């Protein structure tokens, strides 16, 4: 199986998430488009600069890079360190924040910052796309953002290598190796899945099953994973995701 | 050619131009006001005239006024409620740009009569663009009329009076001195309906022209 | 001829990118009224009387970039003239 | 009641977890790097087959970094001075193990790279010793993870 | 559907020597038929075309001499067309001379 | 403030219809299989990215930390 | 997690570049502010196209190359084949 | 209640963030350039290829700035004395990672550019092995940012 | 309330800021200077144009000098016991950054004049490689200007 057709789309996406910006993506798409519009002139022209030749030969690679770079710049909500405002930041109502037992808070605020609390009963709501721009100006953005970025990267890696392990089965099917299936692909893929698919569904389960009503003494993903890996099951100290999970 | 001008096909374009500018000149240029009075138990804290003004883009969520706090003679800020620019601004910009397209079509009928008759191409693109703009107007005008109705229910003084704890205090009773007026917006939406009807009729006549 | 495109194509492209950037930032200074979420920096020390002075300041701030926009426009025009010296 | 100055343990612990492992990493790309340079000088056809020890150095970097970030995100100011000390010990153990793995992988990668070109039968044994270096790194990682949740 | 390498089969061409010259000419024009050597234990001299290659190479070196003379003369040297038809008679030796 | 089912259904139908209607429209050319694999891969990858992003943004655990000047500005600005 | 790593690296680099270069070009002064902002943004543009587009972009391409070569091709892209060289006079240009 | 001059661990962290990195990138350029002076003796056409490892050596210095400037901006006086420790750890971590990357880049770019001055095929392996040095520097910056933000 | 013996943190900062850079500049002039002394024999025509790395080590020392003079300009006895520590960090940082930059510049410029003498084509490439070390020294300047003004 030729991996090139799959790379044609995988590789732009991975370079985009590795270059996750809107404006820069635009600039280097402009560069690639300048290569493509000047195709005929450059073709009939000597260019001893081998770097130029090597980048030009894969110019359509650069176009794909930049298209996916623009798309990820949009989803990440970043453009020269600035978020895009569709004015859909409908989560935290500020006059209602004053209504929420914050009376003359500005008097203290002249020297402090007064982080907004979770579940005041009056907040809630997502952003239309990507991250809310309120986090683009927040100080807790470092704690908020980097965590699900980590978990996201794990997810994407798992799906990619799943795809590779399926390609190995396709090779086995073509070349008639029943030994490479019974003792090969099937056992190893179930080996991988029985850990990482469980990790994925646990991640999503917590993401959609625990809210800020349970923030105090909430579970922890890594602690539960360590409990699994070490066969340690303390009675208390870690809120249990669901009964019978042990 | 004066015959082409005398044809109703372009005269309706002229009518559309005029009544479209008349529509969106008053859709997003109306202003009004409403005044409030506070009957405080302490006469020193009481008020009689509290001016509040509203105008396009009609972002009530970003408008505020100061009224007595009913506590030691202080005051407090009162932010109105409602993001009605999300429809008003969109509809106004929509009307502006499609009216510019109407000017373009009138120009096509005026000078480029030769290319207009050339292979019947002018009628094709004009009809298609006009139908697209008519559907867009239907959506935008319906949304903006619903937003106008939302503004109308939002202008009731008793709602803001009952929402305010200081007005709910005994002996502190805030009555609206002057109620708001929104007749110009009614005229504006009537103009919008007239524009829609005119363009539908012109679509019929243009389809007759094509065949 | 004089000031050939081999040394002025960079001028052309940078002038174009600069003018697009500048009008984008200017419309975000003026029409958006320089929303502090998208543009935190400002220079004000006393604003307890209301946000009116900052609203006035938005006008001067949006003016500050159209000057550079005109400078880039004339630079691009003269660079294109140099390129046309062929 | 918690004694102050407790976090000297954990804050240094994450760092030390990655410090000696970073030194081992710089060592692992070093000597095998030169050996691979020489053996692609003499014959370019086995250039792709000679990259495994570099991947092993990357894996030792993983061994250091996972414990480093695990110690980092397991931090606070009001610690009971027990877990923080345990994080320090775990960091020292994992870092020193990663450094040992770096030394072994660099030296053996160079030796086996210069060997396989002459006698192809040495390549498999080279790979085996690379596995052994990875097992050393994993030993260190095991004790680190035990100390991270004790 | 799973894309893999195009099918490859190899094919033995058996044909007269003169017709082999003409067919190799046509395949040189075409350019889709890798030729595998079947007698790798034979040097250039035993393949009996070594003299042809030597004559062509001496010609080519003299051609580079004339080329550098032309460069000293600054001729535009267009080299536009009439090149790829490549006729194949034996009188080319006379033209070489 | 925004129903989640709305963007859910919108982008499910969008990316799904693209990915599923791809193969039943491409002509039988030299690279039909290649281009259908291309569009399906692009669709699934972009789709999954947006899903994980929005679901991370769902169900917060803590608010954003803001300056007091920011409190003033957002007070006078809107919500 | 190199994904996470380089994403954070770019985000923080862009934020620093904003906080140091284009931030200082904004001032209460009307005309002198814009005149300084001209050259400040000239330097901004030069450095932006330098550090992030060229070097970080190359590093990103390179990390993705390594990822596809090791993390993906090791499982299924086993063994190798002989590079076919269909004979053809490619020296028409040469 | 905060002890005296409490910020000084974090200020020494801002120092250590670029101190050891300035040592490292300096090392990397130090041997690479002396290599290049010899490479271009017999193949001057590779003066362009000579620049490849050095532009990438600059990234160590970039990383030295990354946290150093960040903390030169985010520093203050009223510090609880624990974030100060975190910043010290981050700074020394990224700095010694700069040393590691500098060491590896210098020696490996040196050897690989010799082996490219002889065999052009070695270039691909040169770049490939070069990858892991910046991976290491990246790991350093990862832990440094975590500690600078935790 | 300011503790006694506070200003030395700034004063010793300004002291180190140029002194360590001066050690670097001493190496910078030493090595490349000796190399040019050797290479006058075969190509006397390159004597004047080989001055480049020496001038550049000059600017490396100017970095530390600028920081040292700046701290002296901001020096005061009534320090808050935090600004002097920032001056300390800035001076230490820039000084040793100049140290490393000057050493690397000296040896690389020495090898570069060897290379340019044996082959004139190296004159531009070696210049660029030297610019890299100057940029590293400039980063050492940069952080120290941020901190000593903070």
UniProtKB/Swiss-Prot annotation, chain B:
Key word Protein biosynthesis present: no
Ranges in the topological domain labelled Vesicular: 33-90, 146-183
Subcellular location(s) per record: Cytoplasmic vesicle, Secretory vesicle, Synaptic vesicle membrane; Synapse, Synaptosome
GO molecular function terms attached to this record: cholesterol binding; identical protein binding; SH2 domain binding; syntaxin-1 binding
Domain MARVEL: from-to ranges: 4-211
Keywords: Calcium, Cytoplasmic vesicle, Glycoprotein, Membrane, Phosphoprotein, Repeat, Synapse, Synaptosome, Transmembrane, Transmembrane helix, Ubl conjugation
Membrane-spanning parts: 9-32, 91-114, 122-145, 184-207
Highest taxon listed in the record's lineage: Eukaryota
Cytoplasmic-side segments: 115-121
Glycan attachment points: 42
Protein's membrane topology: Multi-pass membrane protein
Claim: Disulfide bond is one of the keywords in the record: no
Residue numbers of Phosphotyrosine PTMs: 64
Residue positions where Phosphothreonine is found in the record: 210
GO biological process, alphabetically ordered: chemical synaptic transmission; endocytosis; modulation of chemical synaptic transmission; regulation of long-term neuronal synaptic plasticity; regulation of opioid receptor signaling pathway; regulation of short-term neuronal synaptic plasticity; regulation of synaptic vesicle priming
GO cellular component: clathrin-sculpted glutamate transport vesicle membrane; excitatory synapse; membrane; neuromuscular junction; neuron projection; neuron projection terminus; perinuclear region of cytoplasm; presynapse
Modification after translation, per record: Ubiquitinated; mediated by SIAH1 or SIAH2 and leading to its subsequent proteasomal degradation.
Recorded phenotype for the gene knockout or disruption: Mice lackin both SYNGR1 and SYP show normal brain structure and composition, but impaired short-term and long-term synaptic plasticity.
Record note on domains: The calcium-binding activity is thought to be localized in the cytoplasmic tail of the protein.
Encoding gene, per UniProt annotation: Syp
Curated annotation (Swiss-Prot), chain C:
Chief localisation class: membrane
GO molecular function term, any single one: RNA endonuclease activity
Keyword Nucleotide-binding (UniProt): no
Annotated GO CC locations: clathrin-coated vesicle membrane; endomembrane system; vacuolar proton-transporting V-type ATPase, V0 domain
EC number(s) stated in the UniProt entry for this protein: 3.1.-.-
rRNA-binding as UniProt keyword: no
One Pfam family matching this protein: V-ATPase_su_f
Functional description taken from the UniProt entry: Endoribonuclease which preferentially cleaves ApU and ApG phosphodiester bonds. Hydrolyzes UpU bonds at a lower rate. Regulates the activity of vacuolar (H+)-ATPase (V-ATPase) which is responsible for acidifying and maintaining the pH of intracellular compartments. Required at an early stage of receptor-mediated endocytosis.
Protein name: Ribonuclease kappa
Organism field: Mus musculus
UniProt lineage: Eukaryota, Metazoa, Chordata, Craniata, Vertebrata
UniProtKB/Swiss-Prot annotation, chains D, H, I:
All ranges on the Lumenal side of the membrane: 72-87, 148-150
One GO CC term on file: vacuolar proton-transporting V-type ATPase, V0 domain
Site feature: Essential for proton translocation: 134
GO molecular function, one term: P-type proton-exporting transporter activity
GO biological process, one term: lysosomal lumen acidification
Cellular compartment(s): Cytoplasmic vesicle, Clathrin-coated vesicle membrane; Cytoplasmic vesicle, Secretory vesicle, Synaptic vesicle membrane
Post-translational modification: Ubiquitinated by RNF182, leading to its degradation via the ubiquitin-proteasome pathway.
Topology in the lipid bilayer: Multi-pass membrane protein
Keywords per UniProt: Cytoplasmic vesicle, Hydrogen ion transport, Ion transport, Membrane, Synapse, Transmembrane, Transmembrane helix, Transport, Ubl conjugation
Transmembrane segments: 6-28, 51-71, 88-109, 127-147
Pfam families in the cross-refs: ATP-synt_C (PF00137)
Residue intervals annotated with topology Cytoplasmic: 29-50, 110-126
PANTHER family: V-TYPE PROTON ATPASE PROTEOLIPID SUBUNIT
Family statement: Belongs to the V-ATPase proteolipid subunit family.
Quaternary structure, from the entry: V-ATPase is a heteromultimeric enzyme made up of two complexes: the ATP-hydrolytic V1 complex and the proton translocation V0 complex. The V1 complex consists of three catalytic AB heterodimers that form a heterohexamer, three peripheral stalks each consisting of EG heterodimers, one central rotor including subunits D and F, and the regulatory subunits C and H. The proton translocation complex V0 consists of the proton transport subunit a, a ring of proteolipid subunits c9c'', rotary subunit d, subunits e and f, and the accessory subunits ATP6AP1/Ac45 and ATP6AP2/PRR.
UniProtKB/Swiss-Prot annotation, chain G:
Subcellular location: Cytoplasmic vesicle, Clathrin-coated vesicle membrane; Cytoplasmic vesicle, Secretory vesicle, Synaptic vesicle membrane; Melanosome
Transmembrane segments: 33-71
Intervals, Vacuolar compartment: 12-32
Inactivation phenotype: Embryonic lethal. Knockout embryos die at 5 to 6 dpc, before gastrulation.
Spans within the Cytoplasmic topological domain: 72-94
Expression sites (tissue/organ): Predominantly expressed in neurons in the cortex and in the dentate gyrus, CA1 and CA3 regions of the hippocampus (at protein level). Expressed at lower levels in astrocytes, oligodendrocytes and microglia (at protein level). In the cerebellum, present in Purkinje and granule cells (at protein level).
Primary role: Subunit of the V0 complex of vacuolar(H+)-ATPase (V-ATPase), a multisubunit enzyme composed of a peripheral complex (V1) that hydrolyzes ATP and a membrane integral complex (V0) that translocates protons. V-ATPase is responsible for the acidification of various organelles, such as lysosomes, endosomes, the trans-Golgi network, and secretory granules, including synaptic vesicles. In certain cell types, can be exported to the plasma membrane, where it is involved in the acidification of the extracellular environment. Required for assembly and activity of the vacuolar ATPase.
UniProt family annotation: Belongs to the V-ATPase 116 kDa subunit family.
Protein name per UniProt: V-type proton ATPase 116 kDa subunit a 1
Source species of the chain: Mus musculus
Encoding gene (name): Atp6v0a1
Entire-sequence positions represented here: 741 to 834 of 839
